[PDB]
């Protein structure tokens, strides 16, 4: 009985990751699985120090000791109330420069760096400043508050499946407006669970008709 | 001008509450609304102190100074991975006695008593002791972890719409297996917003073809 410690960020549990983990565990009943909530930012040191074996995150950091495998790039969307005036762009999409003056909900409230610092940098690199930012502690709260009439919110594509009601999701047209999904492992690690879990990634992605970046 | 402070349990944002609030907002544009996250327990003192005016709650907690209006009862379900062995009860349902030894997830991690304490109280009232309990910090996480194969999770009916794929929601058949949605106000409060918000509750419930249980 091998033990496999998998670090995850909460923002992947509403996407394909649970299904990927389930398939792996079904196919490898000998392996005891420990799922550990671990911020994208903390996974590098966790892996180095042997506290996790696999880090699933939104990692935009390469470390010399770490093999970072980019699985997917997730398009971002602007969640709006369905009768909000930006619903005119439901087909065509919007650029971030068009929405800077919207009451906008940033999430989460957690130790930095995080998805909020990422979303803020997207405006900063584009030379933009949102005038009406409010911090909300989690995406599911942000989305609910958008539905209640509190403004708009930028989310990854997979968040569209979070079942808050009466929303529309406007495609964000900007080239840099995407969030990566990453698998990180130690460079030294040649365990068979790595190719095995990558096979599960490819199979779950194919089930959902999403083309992955990697090629096994 | 008038400000209305509304306390809410975050999981209620997956249900009909945002549409209720949006409607109130549409019909009463002069009344500024503040939406404040506040657990059912904390709502009691927040109301006494005047920090909120309305408290939308997730379990039954009572206080002699606090008027509690039950809006709806949500039947409890056992969320399981679709391949879990209790799927043989998909077509009927289970009793709490049948699942006392399933690895199970409680939620949220917040000020108690909360939903997790309510669920534990249902077992206790039946003389039952769940043998493996793990507290998960939000329903969103908990359901993603069920999907990942971490166990089972008792949830209210509204949780069936959260959107985590590969789950089944098994009816829990015990008499006491329901979770109320209630509105709390100060007994001494006779403000204009109370009948107004209750009219919005009734309207939204009707718009969805679902029956309430208020004096009207
Ligand atoms: Cl809850
Ligand atoms: Cl609560």
CSV table of C-alpha atoms and ligand atoms in Angstrom, one decimal:
chain,number,residue,atom,x,y,z
A,1,UNK,CA,0.0,0.0,0.0
A,2,UNK,CA,1.6,3.2,-1.3
A,3,UNK,CA,0.5,6.6,0.1
A,4,UNK,CA,-0.1,9.5,-2.3
A,5,UNK,CA,-0.4,13.1,-0.9
A,6,UNK,CA,-2.2,15.5,-3.3
A,7,UNK,CA,-2.2,19.2,-2.7
A,8,UNK,CA,-5.1,21.1,-4.3
A,9,UNK,CA,-6.5,24.6,-4.4
A,10,UNK,CA,-10.2,25.1,-3.7
A,11,UNK,CA,-10.7,26.8,-7.1
A,12,UNK,CA,-10.1,23.4,-8.9
A,13,UNK,CA,-12.7,21.4,-6.9
A,14,UNK,CA,-15.5,23.0,-9.0
A,15,UNK,CA,-13.8,21.8,-12.2
A,16,UNK,CA,-12.5,18.6,-13.6
A,17,UNK,CA,-10.0,17.8,-10.7
A,18,UNK,CA,-12.4,15.7,-8.5
A,19,UNK,CA,-13.3,13.5,-11.4
A,20,UNK,CA,-9.5,13.1,-12.3
A,21,UNK,CA,-8.8,12.1,-8.7
A,22,UNK,CA,-11.8,9.8,-8.5
A,23,UNK,CA,-10.7,8.0,-11.7
A,24,UNK,CA,-7.1,7.5,-10.4
A,25,UNK,CA,-8.3,6.2,-7.1
A,26,UNK,CA,-10.8,3.8,-8.8
A,27,UNK,CA,-8.0,2.5,-11.1
A,28,UNK,CA,-5.4,2.3,-8.3
A,29,UNK,CA,-7.2,0.9,-5.2
A,30,UNK,CA,-3.8,-0.1,-3.6
A,31,UNK,CA,-2.8,3.6,-3.2
A,32,UNK,CA,-4.0,5.4,-0.1
A,33,UNK,CA,-4.9,8.9,-1.1
A,34,UNK,CA,-4.6,12.0,1.1
A,35,UNK,CA,-6.1,15.2,-0.2
A,36,UNK,CA,-4.5,18.3,1.3
A,37,UNK,CA,-5.7,21.9,0.7
A,38,UNK,CA,-2.6,23.7,-0.3
A,39,UNK,CA,-2.4,27.2,-1.9
A,40,UNK,CA,-0.8,27.4,-5.3
A,41,UNK,CA,1.9,29.5,-3.6
A,42,UNK,CA,2.7,26.9,-0.9
A,43,UNK,CA,2.8,23.8,-3.2
A,44,UNK,CA,6.4,24.5,-4.3
A,45,UNK,CA,7.8,24.3,-0.8
A,46,UNK,CA,5.4,21.5,0.2
A,47,UNK,CA,6.8,19.4,-2.7
A,48,UNK,CA,10.4,20.3,-1.9
A,49,UNK,CA,9.9,19.4,1.7
A,50,UNK,CA,8.1,16.1,1.0
A,51,UNK,CA,4.7,17.2,2.5
A,52,UNK,CA,2.9,16.6,-0.8
A,53,UNK,CA,3.7,14.5,-3.8
A,54,UNK,CA,1.4,16.2,-6.4
A,55,UNK,CA,0.4,19.8,-6.5
A,56,UNK,CA,-2.6,20.8,-8.5
A,57,UNK,CA,-2.9,24.5,-8.7
A,58,UNK,CA,-2.8,27.6,-10.9
A,59,UNK,CA,0.9,27.9,-10.7
A,60,UNK,CA,2.7,30.6,-12.8
A,61,UNK,CA,6.0,30.0,-11.0
A,62,UNK,CA,8.8,27.7,-12.3
A,63,UNK,CA,11.2,26.5,-9.6
A,64,UNK,CA,14.5,24.6,-10.4
A,65,UNK,CA,13.5,21.7,-8.1
A,66,UNK,CA,10.0,21.4,-9.5
A,67,UNK,CA,8.6,19.9,-12.7
A,68,UNK,CA,5.7,22.2,-13.6
A,69,UNK,CA,3.2,20.6,-16.1
A,70,UNK,CA,0.7,23.0,-17.6
A,71,UNK,CA,-2.5,21.0,-18.2
A,72,UNK,CA,-4.9,23.6,-19.4
A,73,UNK,CA,-5.4,27.3,-19.9
A,74,UNK,CA,-8.8,28.3,-18.7
A,75,UNK,CA,-10.5,31.2,-20.4
A,76,UNK,CA,-11.9,33.9,-18.0
A,77,UNK,CA,-15.5,35.1,-18.0
A,78,UNK,CA,-17.3,38.2,-16.6
A,79,UNK,CA,-20.2,37.0,-14.5
A,80,UNK,CA,-23.1,39.4,-14.6
A,81,UNK,CA,-26.8,39.5,-13.6
A,82,UNK,CA,-28.7,38.4,-16.7
A,83,UNK,CA,-30.5,41.7,-17.1
A,84,UNK,CA,-27.4,43.8,-16.5
A,85,UNK,CA,-26.5,46.2,-19.4
A,86,UNK,CA,-23.4,44.3,-20.4
A,87,UNK,CA,-25.6,41.4,-21.5
A,88,UNK,CA,-25.4,43.1,-24.9
A,89,UNK,CA,-21.9,41.5,-25.1
A,90,UNK,CA,-23.1,38.0,-24.3
A,91,UNK,CA,-22.3,36.8,-27.9
A,92,UNK,CA,-19.4,39.1,-28.8
A,93,UNK,CA,-17.5,39.3,-25.4
A,94,UNK,CA,-15.9,42.3,-23.7
A,95,UNK,CA,-12.4,43.7,-23.1
A,96,UNK,CA,-11.3,44.6,-19.5
A,97,UNK,CA,-11.0,48.3,-20.4
A,98,UNK,CA,-14.8,48.4,-21.0
A,99,UNK,CA,-15.6,47.3,-17.4
A,100,UNK,CA,-13.2,49.3,-15.2
A,101,UNK,CA,-16.1,51.5,-13.8
A,102,UNK,CA,-18.4,48.6,-12.9
A,103,UNK,CA,-18.8,47.7,-9.2
A,104,UNK,CA,-16.6,44.7,-9.2
A,105,UNK,CA,-16.2,41.9,-6.7
A,106,UNK,CA,-12.6,40.5,-6.2
A,107,UNK,CA,-12.1,37.1,-4.5
A,108,UNK,CA,-10.8,35.4,-2.4
A,109,UNK,CA,-9.6,36.9,0.9
A,110,UNK,CA,-6.6,34.7,1.7
A,111,UNK,CA,-2.9,35.0,2.1
A,112,UNK,CA,-1.1,36.5,-0.9
A,113,UNK,CA,-0.4,35.8,-3.7
A,114,UNK,CA,-3.8,34.5,-4.7
A,115,UNK,CA,-6.5,34.7,-7.4
A,116,UNK,CA,-7.3,38.3,-6.4
A,117,UNK,CA,-3.7,39.5,-6.8
A,118,UNK,CA,-3.7,37.7,-10.2
A,119,UNK,CA,-6.9,39.4,-11.4
A,120,UNK,CA,-5.6,42.8,-10.1
A,121,UNK,CA,-2.3,42.4,-12.1
A,122,UNK,CA,-4.3,41.7,-15.3
A,123,UNK,CA,-5.7,45.2,-15.0
A,124,UNK,CA,-2.3,46.7,-14.0
A,125,UNK,CA,-0.4,45.0,-16.9
A,126,UNK,CA,-3.1,46.3,-19.2
A,127,UNK,CA,-2.6,49.8,-17.7
A,128,UNK,CA,-6.0,49.8,-16.2
A,129,UNK,CA,-7.4,50.7,-12.7
A,130,UNK,CA,-10.8,49.4,-11.6
A,131,UNK,CA,-12.5,52.3,-9.7
A,132,UNK,CA,-15.0,50.2,-7.7
A,133,UNK,CA,-13.4,47.1,-6.2
A,134,UNK,CA,-14.8,45.2,-3.3
A,135,UNK,CA,-13.1,42.2,-1.7
A,136,UNK,CA,-15.3,39.1,-1.1
A,137,UNK,CA,-13.9,36.1,0.7
A,138,UNK,CA,-14.8,33.3,-1.8
A,139,UNK,CA,-16.0,33.0,-5.4
A,140,UNK,CA,-19.3,31.4,-4.5
A,141,UNK,CA,-20.1,34.5,-2.4
A,142,UNK,CA,-18.9,36.8,-5.2
A,143,UNK,CA,-21.2,35.0,-7.6
A,144,UNK,CA,-24.2,35.1,-5.3
A,145,UNK,CA,-23.8,38.8,-4.7
A,146,UNK,CA,-23.6,39.5,-8.4
A,147,UNK,CA,-27.0,37.6,-8.7
A,148,UNK,CA,-28.4,39.8,-5.8
A,149,UNK,CA,-27.4,42.9,-7.7
A,150,UNK,CA,-24.0,43.9,-6.2
A,151,UNK,CA,-22.1,44.2,-9.5
A,152,UNK,CA,-19.9,41.9,-11.6
A,153,UNK,CA,-17.1,39.4,-11.1
A,154,UNK,CA,-14.3,37.8,-13.2
A,155,UNK,CA,-14.2,34.0,-13.0
A,156,UNK,CA,-12.5,31.0,-14.6
A,157,UNK,CA,-14.5,29.1,-17.3
A,158,UNK,CA,-15.1,26.2,-14.9
A,159,UNK,CA,-16.8,28.5,-12.4
A,160,UNK,CA,-19.7,28.8,-14.8
A,161,UNK,CA,-20.8,25.4,-13.4
A,162,UNK,CA,-21.2,26.9,-9.9
A,163,UNK,CA,-25.0,26.8,-9.8
A,164,UNK,CA,-25.8,30.3,-8.7
A,165,UNK,CA,-28.9,31.4,-10.6
A,166,UNK,CA,-29.9,34.2,-13.0
A,167,UNK,CA,-26.3,34.9,-14.2
A,168,UNK,CA,-24.8,35.4,-17.7
A,169,UNK,CA,-21.1,34.8,-18.3
A,170,UNK,CA,-19.5,37.1,-20.8
A,171,UNK,CA,-16.4,35.9,-22.6
A,172,UNK,CA,-13.3,38.1,-21.8
A,173,UNK,CA,-11.6,38.8,-25.2
A,174,UNK,CA,-8.2,39.8,-23.8
A,175,UNK,CA,-5.3,37.5,-24.7
A,176,UNK,CA,-3.8,37.4,-21.2
A,177,UNK,CA,-7.3,36.9,-19.7
A,178,UNK,CA,-6.9,33.2,-18.8
A,179,UNK,CA,-6.0,31.1,-15.7
A,180,UNK,CA,-3.6,28.1,-16.0
A,181,UNK,CA,-4.3,24.7,-14.4
A,182,UNK,CA,-1.0,23.2,-13.4
A,183,UNK,CA,0.3,19.9,-12.0
A,184,UNK,CA,3.6,20.3,-10.1
A,185,UNK,CA,5.9,17.5,-9.0
A,186,UNK,CA,9.5,17.1,-7.8
A,187,UNK,CA,12.1,17.0,-10.6
A,188,UNK,CA,13.5,13.9,-8.9
A,189,UNK,CA,10.2,12.1,-8.8
A,190,UNK,CA,9.8,9.3,-11.3
A,191,UNK,CA,7.0,7.5,-9.5
A,192,UNK,CA,4.4,5.7,-11.7
A,193,UNK,CA,1.5,7.7,-10.2
A,194,UNK,CA,2.7,10.7,-12.3
A,195,UNK,CA,2.2,9.1,-15.8
A,196,UNK,CA,-0.9,7.3,-14.3
A,197,UNK,CA,-2.5,10.6,-13.1
A,198,UNK,CA,-1.6,12.3,-16.4
A,199,UNK,CA,-3.4,9.5,-18.2
A,200,UNK,CA,-6.5,10.2,-16.0
A,201,UNK,CA,-6.2,13.9,-16.8
A,202,UNK,CA,-6.2,13.1,-20.6
A,203,UNK,CA,-9.2,10.8,-20.2
A,204,UNK,CA,-11.3,13.2,-18.1
A,205,UNK,CA,-10.5,16.0,-20.5
A,206,UNK,CA,-11.5,13.9,-23.5
A,207,UNK,CA,-14.7,12.9,-21.7
A,208,UNK,CA,-15.6,16.6,-21.4
A,209,UNK,CA,-14.4,17.5,-25.0
A,210,UNK,CA,-11.7,19.8,-23.7
A,211,UNK,CA,-8.4,19.6,-25.6
A,212,UNK,CA,-5.5,19.6,-23.1
A,213,UNK,CA,-2.1,21.3,-23.6
A,214,UNK,CA,-0.1,18.2,-22.8
A,215,UNK,CA,0.4,15.3,-25.2
A,216,UNK,CA,0.9,11.8,-23.6
B,1,UNK,CA,-32.4,58.0,3.0
B,2,UNK,CA,-33.2,54.5,4.3
B,3,UNK,CA,-30.6,51.8,4.7
B,4,UNK,CA,-31.6,48.1,5.0
B,5,UNK,CA,-28.9,45.8,6.5
B,6,UNK,CA,-29.5,42.1,5.6
B,7,UNK,CA,-27.5,39.3,7.3
B,8,UNK,CA,-27.2,36.0,5.4
B,9,UNK,CA,-25.7,32.5,5.6
B,10,UNK,CA,-23.5,32.1,2.5
B,11,UNK,CA,-24.9,28.8,1.3
B,12,UNK,CA,-28.3,30.5,0.9
B,13,UNK,CA,-26.9,32.3,-2.1
B,14,UNK,CA,-27.1,29.1,-4.1
B,15,UNK,CA,-30.9,29.1,-3.7
B,16,UNK,CA,-33.7,31.6,-4.3
B,17,UNK,CA,-32.4,34.4,-1.9
B,18,UNK,CA,-30.4,36.4,-4.5
B,19,UNK,CA,-33.5,36.6,-6.7
B,20,UNK,CA,-35.6,37.7,-3.7
B,21,UNK,CA,-33.0,40.4,-2.9
B,22,UNK,CA,-32.8,41.5,-6.5
B,23,UNK,CA,-36.6,41.9,-6.7
B,24,UNK,CA,-36.7,43.9,-3.5
B,25,UNK,CA,-34.0,46.1,-5.0
B,26,UNK,CA,-36.0,46.6,-8.2
B,27,UNK,CA,-39.3,47.4,-6.5
B,28,UNK,CA,-37.6,49.6,-3.8
B,29,UNK,CA,-34.8,51.6,-5.4
B,30,UNK,CA,-34.7,54.4,-2.8
B,31,UNK,CA,-33.8,51.9,0.0
B,32,UNK,CA,-30.0,51.3,0.1
B,33,UNK,CA,-29.2,47.6,0.8
B,34,UNK,CA,-26.2,46.3,2.7
B,35,UNK,CA,-25.6,42.6,2.4
B,36,UNK,CA,-23.6,41.2,5.3
B,37,UNK,CA,-22.5,37.6,5.7
B,38,UNK,CA,-23.7,36.5,9.2
B,39,UNK,CA,-24.3,33.0,10.5
B,40,UNK,CA,-27.7,32.0,11.9
B,41,UNK,CA,-26.3,32.1,15.5
B,42,UNK,CA,-24.5,35.4,15.1
B,43,UNK,CA,-27.6,36.9,13.5
B,44,UNK,CA,-29.4,36.8,16.9
B,45,UNK,CA,-27.0,39.3,18.6
B,46,UNK,CA,-26.5,41.3,15.4
B,47,UNK,CA,-30.3,41.9,15.3
B,48,UNK,CA,-30.4,42.8,19.1
B,49,UNK,CA,-27.6,45.3,18.5
B,50,UNK,CA,-29.0,46.8,15.3
B,51,UNK,CA,-26.1,45.6,13.1
B,52,UNK,CA,-28.6,44.0,10.8
B,53,UNK,CA,-32.3,44.3,10.3
B,54,UNK,CA,-33.1,41.1,8.5
B,55,UNK,CA,-31.4,37.7,9.1
B,56,UNK,CA,-31.8,34.9,6.6
B,57,UNK,CA,-30.9,31.8,8.6
B,58,UNK,CA,-30.1,28.1,7.8
B,59,UNK,CA,-31.1,26.3,11.0
B,60,UNK,CA,-33.5,26.8,13.9
B,61,UNK,CA,-32.1,29.0,16.6
B,62,UNK,CA,-34.5,30.9,18.8
B,63,UNK,CA,-34.5,33.9,21.1
B,64,UNK,CA,-37.4,35.5,23.0
B,65,UNK,CA,-36.6,39.0,21.6
B,66,UNK,CA,-36.3,37.7,18.0
B,67,UNK,CA,-39.2,37.1,15.6
B,68,UNK,CA,-38.6,34.1,13.4
B,69,UNK,CA,-40.6,33.5,10.2
B,70,UNK,CA,-40.1,30.1,8.6
B,71,UNK,CA,-40.2,30.7,4.8
B,72,UNK,CA,-39.6,27.2,3.5
B,73,UNK,CA,-38.5,23.7,4.6
B,74,UNK,CA,-35.7,22.1,2.6
B,75,UNK,CA,-35.7,18.3,2.6
B,76,UNK,CA,-32.3,16.7,3.4
B,77,UNK,CA,-30.4,14.6,0.9
B,78,UNK,CA,-27.3,12.4,1.2
B,79,UNK,CA,-24.8,13.6,-1.5
B,80,UNK,CA,-22.8,10.6,-2.7
B,81,UNK,CA,-20.5,9.9,-5.6
B,82,UNK,CA,-22.8,8.3,-8.3
B,83,UNK,CA,-20.8,4.9,-8.0
B,84,UNK,CA,-21.0,4.7,-4.2
B,85,UNK,CA,-22.9,1.6,-2.9
B,86,UNK,CA,-25.8,3.6,-1.4
B,87,UNK,CA,-26.7,4.4,-5.1
B,88,UNK,CA,-28.9,1.3,-4.7
B,89,UNK,CA,-31.2,3.6,-2.7
B,90,UNK,CA,-31.4,6.3,-5.4
B,91,UNK,CA,-34.9,5.2,-6.4
B,92,UNK,CA,-36.2,5.4,-2.8
B,93,UNK,CA,-34.1,6.9,0.0
B,94,UNK,CA,-32.2,6.1,3.2
B,95,UNK,CA,-32.7,6.6,6.9
B,96,UNK,CA,-29.9,8.2,9.0
B,97,UNK,CA,-29.4,4.8,10.8
B,98,UNK,CA,-28.2,3.2,7.4
B,99,UNK,CA,-25.2,5.6,7.1
B,100,UNK,CA,-23.7,6.0,10.6
B,101,UNK,CA,-20.5,4.2,9.6
B,102,UNK,CA,-19.9,6.0,6.2
B,103,UNK,CA,-16.9,8.3,6.1
B,104,UNK,CA,-18.8,11.6,6.0
B,105,UNK,CA,-18.2,15.3,5.6
B,106,UNK,CA,-19.6,18.0,7.7
B,107,UNK,CA,-19.7,21.7,6.8
B,108,UNK,CA,-19.2,24.6,7.1
B,109,UNK,CA,-16.3,25.6,9.4
B,110,UNK,CA,-17.8,28.7,11.0
B,111,UNK,CA,-19.4,30.0,14.2
B,112,UNK,CA,-21.4,27.2,15.9
B,113,UNK,CA,-24.1,26.1,16.2
B,114,UNK,CA,-24.2,25.8,12.4
B,115,UNK,CA,-25.4,23.3,9.8
B,116,UNK,CA,-22.7,20.8,10.9
B,117,UNK,CA,-24.0,21.0,14.5
B,118,UNK,CA,-27.6,20.6,13.3
B,119,UNK,CA,-26.6,17.4,11.3
B,120,UNK,CA,-24.8,16.0,14.4
B,121,UNK,CA,-27.9,16.8,16.5
B,122,UNK,CA,-30.1,14.6,14.1
B,123,UNK,CA,-27.9,11.6,14.8
B,124,UNK,CA,-27.9,12.3,18.5
B,125,UNK,CA,-31.7,12.6,18.8
B,126,UNK,CA,-31.9,9.1,17.2
B,127,UNK,CA,-29.3,7.7,19.6
B,128,UNK,CA,-26.9,7.3,16.7
B,129,UNK,CA,-23.1,8.0,16.7
B,130,UNK,CA,-21.4,8.7,13.3
B,131,UNK,CA,-18.1,6.9,13.5
B,132,UNK,CA,-16.1,8.9,10.9
B,133,UNK,CA,-16.7,12.7,10.7
B,134,UNK,CA,-14.5,15.3,8.9
B,135,UNK,CA,-15.3,19.0,9.0
B,136,UNK,CA,-14.9,20.8,5.6
B,137,UNK,CA,-14.9,24.6,5.5
B,138,UNK,CA,-17.6,25.2,2.9
B,139,UNK,CA,-20.4,23.3,1.1
B,140,UNK,CA,-18.7,24.0,-2.2
B,141,UNK,CA,-15.5,22.2,-1.0
B,142,UNK,CA,-17.4,19.4,0.7
B,143,UNK,CA,-19.3,18.5,-2.5
B,144,UNK,CA,-16.1,18.7,-4.6
B,145,UNK,CA,-14.5,16.3,-2.1
B,146,UNK,CA,-17.5,13.8,-2.3
B,147,UNK,CA,-16.9,13.9,-6.1
B,148,UNK,CA,-13.2,13.1,-5.5
B,149,UNK,CA,-14.2,10.0,-3.4
B,150,UNK,CA,-13.7,11.4,0.1
B,151,UNK,CA,-17.1,10.2,1.5
B,152,UNK,CA,-20.7,11.2,1.7
B,153,UNK,CA,-22.2,14.6,2.7
B,154,UNK,CA,-25.7,15.4,4.1
B,155,UNK,CA,-27.0,18.6,2.4
B,156,UNK,CA,-30.3,20.4,2.1
B,157,UNK,CA,-32.3,20.0,-1.2
B,158,UNK,CA,-31.1,23.4,-2.6
B,159,UNK,CA,-27.6,21.9,-2.7
B,160,UNK,CA,-28.8,19.6,-5.6
B,161,UNK,CA,-28.3,22.6,-7.9
B,162,UNK,CA,-24.7,23.5,-6.8
B,163,UNK,CA,-23.4,22.0,-10.0
B,164,UNK,CA,-20.6,19.5,-8.9
B,165,UNK,CA,-20.7,16.7,-11.5
B,166,UNK,CA,-20.9,12.9,-10.9
B,167,UNK,CA,-23.0,13.1,-7.7
B,168,UNK,CA,-26.3,11.5,-6.6
B,169,UNK,CA,-28.6,13.0,-4.0
B,170,UNK,CA,-30.3,10.4,-1.9
B,171,UNK,CA,-33.5,11.3,-0.1
B,172,UNK,CA,-33.1,11.1,3.7
B,173,UNK,CA,-36.4,9.6,4.9
B,174,UNK,CA,-36.5,10.4,8.7
B,175,UNK,CA,-39.3,12.7,9.9
B,176,UNK,CA,-36.8,15.3,11.3
B,177,UNK,CA,-34.6,15.4,8.1
B,178,UNK,CA,-35.4,18.9,7.0
B,179,UNK,CA,-33.6,22.3,7.1
B,180,UNK,CA,-35.6,25.5,7.4
B,181,UNK,CA,-35.0,28.7,5.5
B,182,UNK,CA,-36.2,31.4,8.0
B,183,UNK,CA,-36.2,35.1,8.3
B,184,UNK,CA,-35.4,36.6,11.7
B,185,UNK,CA,-36.2,40.2,12.8
B,186,UNK,CA,-36.4,42.0,16.1
B,187,UNK,CA,-39.8,41.4,17.8
B,188,UNK,CA,-40.0,45.2,18.3
B,189,UNK,CA,-39.3,46.0,14.7
B,190,UNK,CA,-42.3,47.1,12.7
B,191,UNK,CA,-40.5,48.8,9.8
B,192,UNK,CA,-41.9,49.1,6.2
B,193,UNK,CA,-39.2,46.7,4.8
B,194,UNK,CA,-40.6,43.6,6.6
B,195,UNK,CA,-43.9,43.2,4.7
B,196,UNK,CA,-42.0,44.4,1.6
B,197,UNK,CA,-39.3,41.7,1.8
B,198,UNK,CA,-41.9,39.0,2.7
B,199,UNK,CA,-43.9,40.0,-0.4
B,200,UNK,CA,-40.8,39.5,-2.5
B,201,UNK,CA,-40.2,36.0,-0.9
B,202,UNK,CA,-43.8,35.0,-1.8
B,203,UNK,CA,-43.5,36.4,-5.3
B,204,UNK,CA,-40.2,34.7,-6.2
B,205,UNK,CA,-41.5,31.4,-4.7
B,206,UNK,CA,-44.6,31.7,-6.9
B,207,UNK,CA,-42.5,32.6,-10.0
B,208,UNK,CA,-40.7,29.3,-9.5
B,209,UNK,CA,-43.9,27.4,-9.0
B,210,UNK,CA,-42.9,26.5,-5.4
B,211,UNK,CA,-45.2,26.9,-2.3
B,212,UNK,CA,-44.2,29.0,0.7
B,213,UNK,CA,-45.7,28.7,4.3
B,214,UNK,CA,-46.1,32.3,5.5
B,215,UNK,CA,-49.2,34.1,6.8
B,216,UNK,CA,-49.3,36.3,3.7
C,1,LIG,CL1,-24.7,26.2,5.6
C,2,LIG,CL1,-25.2,29.2,10.1
